[PDB]
Ligand binder design. Structure first.
Ligand SMILES: [Cl-]
Ligand SMILES: [Cl-]
Ligand SMILES: [Cl-]
Ligand SMILES: [Cl-]
Ligand SMILES: [Cl-]
Ligand SMILES: [Cl-]
Ligand SMILES: [Cl-]
Ligand SMILES: [Cl-]
Ligand SMILES: [Cl-]
Ligand SMILES: [Cl-]
Ligand SMILES: [Cl-]
Ligand SMILES: [Cl-]
Ligand SMILES: [Cl-]
Ligand SMILES: [Cl-]
Ligand code: NA
Ligand code: NA
Ligand code: NA
Ligand code: NA
Ligand code: NA
Ligand code: NA
Ligand code: NA
Ligand code: NA
Ligand code: NA
Ligand code: NA
Ligand code: NA
Ligand code: NA
Ligand code: NA
Ligand code: NA
Ligand code: NA
Ligand code: NA
Ligand code: NA
Lengths: 226, 210, 112, 122
């Protein structure tokens, strides 16, 4: 069973360098070329180069010549991809891929799970969770509530409701990158408008990059205007 | 250099129908062309190689063909697991992908508007969220109007992946303003136009009200 | 067309020694240079591609270096079976073009 | 697995025509172009032309446009070189070779036929 296990997500600043690893198992590591392919958010696949782990010989796409270095350590069946002088548009998921056959071929049958590399000047920051209050006066026999998970970095954030007891109707939107460099998302759920006064609704937000766990109770806004 | 142009950008088909995906090379060199499948959060999966040979473990409903520059991936009868992004490849070059999504009956969105929380205003910013819930097709128009003034450049949208149960989409539009600007106005409205709505739907609230 | 200049028409060496065959491209060919070995009667056999990468089954005695226009084939621990002609090739842009060839004499000789 | 086998030596007179074959096996024929190289005495190796094995469309190098024709037979995985109006200078060994793309470059020639000697006897 061929398997390619890569290193974890990375966070770097412009001008810095990053090195992703790709541990191979289930086959003779030195018998197959190893390729590296990246994918920017919402974009397609981009070939970066390959390395012959048997000889150490490499070949880089012209776009990365002089800025990428591919190495291998046969003693631990690991291939590496080092990209230096990072910039914002280097933010992408980086994959290692192995050909189908034992000779050189472009048929990438085996892939690693991908390594997200975020390039940004922002510092690690936990989210600020705010309620998206429901209202009996805003129904399209259903109310909507949620949590605004704003100003956090880096990806990712996970949101649950009532510690996982509430799942149906939950929509946790993909995060958006704000001009400030910090991410933001919302998590909403549709529920019966009649249960707003009886059922408790709490969103459980987790931002592991900052070891942050936040529980926010969501209820209708308290109006006091006369 | 070879440029692979895939078309259409998006295919909308129902389970059981046949899908035809096109990939055109800027120039004809060989049949050394592969097709890949990719789902959100996962790595690509090899489907076809040599233009028409099927990779191991791939169901036979996937087939590849080609004639000169024009290559075609055909899925005879779509299964729910087939809706994903598909890429063609020749040498180091990849097509830009064709998204295959589920076509279902038109479903209008449920529209909700959320004012900013008092807690957030205390921090100095106001986030106004408009929610479109479980609609199809994915295309919708969401316009913000503050005191009947069209907003531009101060809002962002986010769309969910197609729901695995009802094959609908949900969309959020977030208007972000400073506390100062948020206090200069009263009426905040979200205008939604969608194919499933006989007329546009408007949700609004007046700042400092009930 | 790009010209590949092998100024060394002939070179003599002994078994166990090392020799370097040079090749000068007339244009920047990046790293797209390959090296071939041809024995009498046989066709050319690929040794190196992309300047420094060995073809399947090629011993590591054969190494290649260079980028741009200066390229070199180095044969270490020369064996009697290395008696042959050697040609460089640029595969940066078509038409592919070959060097003039370098005959390698093995003083021990008598093999391959 | 990869093998390119060419037809045997040809003894021809000036003005005649000769057709050399190149039989491929061990791989998907249409995946790789076939290139033809001339090795004439004193002239070194010269690329004559190449053919798209998938469409059959050939391309001739400048110095070989005219009397040299490159054709195909996909059903037999065979490429052909035909030389018309043979001249003395055409006396040489002719090779077919498979072109492979390894990235960031044009195709090189990792696999060659055994060669075909063409003798022009007057
Ligand atoms: Cl090395
Ligand atoms: Cl509501
Ligand atoms: Cl495309
Ligand atoms: Cl088309
Ligand atoms: Cl070509
Ligand atoms: Cl539409
Ligand atoms: Cl706006
Ligand atoms: Cl989105
Ligand atoms: Cl000399
Ligand atoms: Cl020496
Ligand atoms: Cl070219
Ligand atoms: Cl022709
Ligand atoms: Cl033909
Ligand atoms: Cl070989
Ligand atoms: Na290396
Ligand atoms: Na849901
Ligand atoms: Na009132
Ligand atoms: Na088509
Ligand atoms: Na995966
Ligand atoms: Na299946
Ligand atoms: Na069809
Ligand atoms: Na399925
Ligand atoms: Na994709
Ligand atoms: Na490119
Ligand atoms: Na819109
Ligand atoms: Na979602
Ligand atoms: Na020249
Ligand atoms: Na190599
Ligand atoms: Na070796
Ligand atoms: Na020669
Ligand atoms: Na080329």
């Amino acid at each position: 069973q061929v398997q390619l296990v890569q290193s974890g997500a990375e966070v770097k600043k412009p001008g810095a360098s990053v090195k992703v690893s790709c541990k191979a198992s289930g086959y003779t590591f030195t018998g197959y070329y190893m390729h590296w392919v990246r994918q920017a958010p919402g974009q397609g696949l981009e070939w970066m180069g390959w390395i012959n782990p048997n000889s150490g010989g490499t070949n880089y796409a012209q776009k990365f010549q002089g800025r990428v270095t591919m190495t291998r350590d046969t003693s631990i069946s690991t291939a590496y991809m080092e990209l230096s002088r990072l910039r914002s548009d280097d933010t992408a998921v980086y994959y290692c891929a192995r050909g189908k056959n034992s000779d050189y071929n472009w048929d990438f049958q085996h892939w690693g799970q991908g390594t997200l590399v975020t390039v940004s000047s922002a510092s690690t920051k936990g989210p600020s969770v705010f309620p998206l209050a429901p209202s009996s006066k805003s129904t399209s026999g259903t109310a909507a509530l949620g949590c605004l998970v704003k100003d956090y970095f880096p990806e990712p954030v996970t949101v649950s409701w009532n510690s996982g007891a509430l799942t149906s109707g939950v929509h946790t939107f993909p995060a958006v990158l704000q001009s400030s460099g910090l991410y933001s998302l919302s998590s909403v759920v549709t529920v019966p408008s009649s249960s707003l006064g009886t059922q408790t609704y709490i969103c459980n937000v987790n931002h592991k990059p900052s070891n942050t766990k936040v529980d926010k109770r969501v209820e209708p806004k308290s109006c006091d205007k006369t | 250099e070879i440029v692979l142009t895939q078309s259409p950008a998006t295919l909308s088909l129902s389970p059981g129908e046949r899908a035809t995906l096109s990939c055109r090379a800027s120039q004809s060199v060989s049949s050394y062309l592969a097709w890949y499948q990719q789902k959100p959060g996962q790595a690509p999966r090899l489907l076809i190689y040599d233009a028409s040979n099927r990779a191991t473990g791939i169901p036979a409903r996937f087939s590849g063909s080609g004639s000169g520059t024009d290559f075609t991936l055909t899925i005879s009868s779509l299964e729910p697991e087939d809706f994903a992004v598909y890429y063609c490849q020749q040498y180091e070059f990849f097509g830009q992908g064709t998204k295959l999504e589920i076509k279902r009956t038109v479903a209008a969105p449920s529209v909700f508007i959320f004012p900013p929380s008092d807690e957030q205003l205390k921090s100095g910013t106001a986030s106004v969220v408009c929610l479109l819930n479980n609609f199809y097709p994915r295309e919708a128009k969401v316009q913000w109007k503050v005191d009947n003034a069209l907003q531009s450049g101060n809002s962002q949208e986010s769309v969910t992946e197609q729901d695995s149960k009802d094959s609908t989409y949900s969309l959020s539009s977030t208007l972000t303003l400073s506390k100062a600007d948020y206090e200069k106005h009263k009426v905040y409205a979200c205008e939604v136009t969608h194919q499933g709505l006989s007329s546009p739907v408007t949700k609004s609230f007046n700042r400092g009200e009930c | 067309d790009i010209v590949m200049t092998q100024s060394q028409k002939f070179m003599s060496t002994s078994v166990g020694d090392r020799v370097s065959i040079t090749c000068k491209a007339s244009q920047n060919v990046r790293t797209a240079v390959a090296w071939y070995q041809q024995k009498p009667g046989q066709s050319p056999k690929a040794l190196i591609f992309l300047a420094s990468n060995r073809h399947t089954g090629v011993p590591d005695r054969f190494t290649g270096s260079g980028s741009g226009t200066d390229f070199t084939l180095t044969i270490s621990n020369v064996q009697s079976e290395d008696l042959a002609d050697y040609f460089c090739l640029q595969h940066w842009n078509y038409p592919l073009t070959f060097g003039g060839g370098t005959k390698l004499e093995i003083k021990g000789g008598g093999g391959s | 697995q990869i093998q390119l086998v060419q037809s045997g030596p040809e003894l021809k007179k000036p003005g005649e025509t000769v057709k050399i074959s190149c039989k491929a096996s061990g791989y998907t024929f249409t995946n790789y172009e076939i290139n033809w190289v001339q090795q004439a005495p004193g002239k070194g190796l010269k690329l004559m032309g190449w053919i798209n094995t998938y469409t059959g469309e050939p391309t001739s190098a400048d110095d070989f446009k005219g009397r040299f024709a490159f054709s195909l037979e996909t059903s037999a995985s065979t490429a052909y070189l035909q030389i018309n109006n043979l001249k003395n200078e055409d006396a040489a060994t002719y090779f077919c070779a498979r072109g492979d793309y390894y990235g960031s470059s044009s195709a090189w020639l990792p696999y060659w036929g055994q060669g075909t000697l063409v003798t022009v006897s007057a």
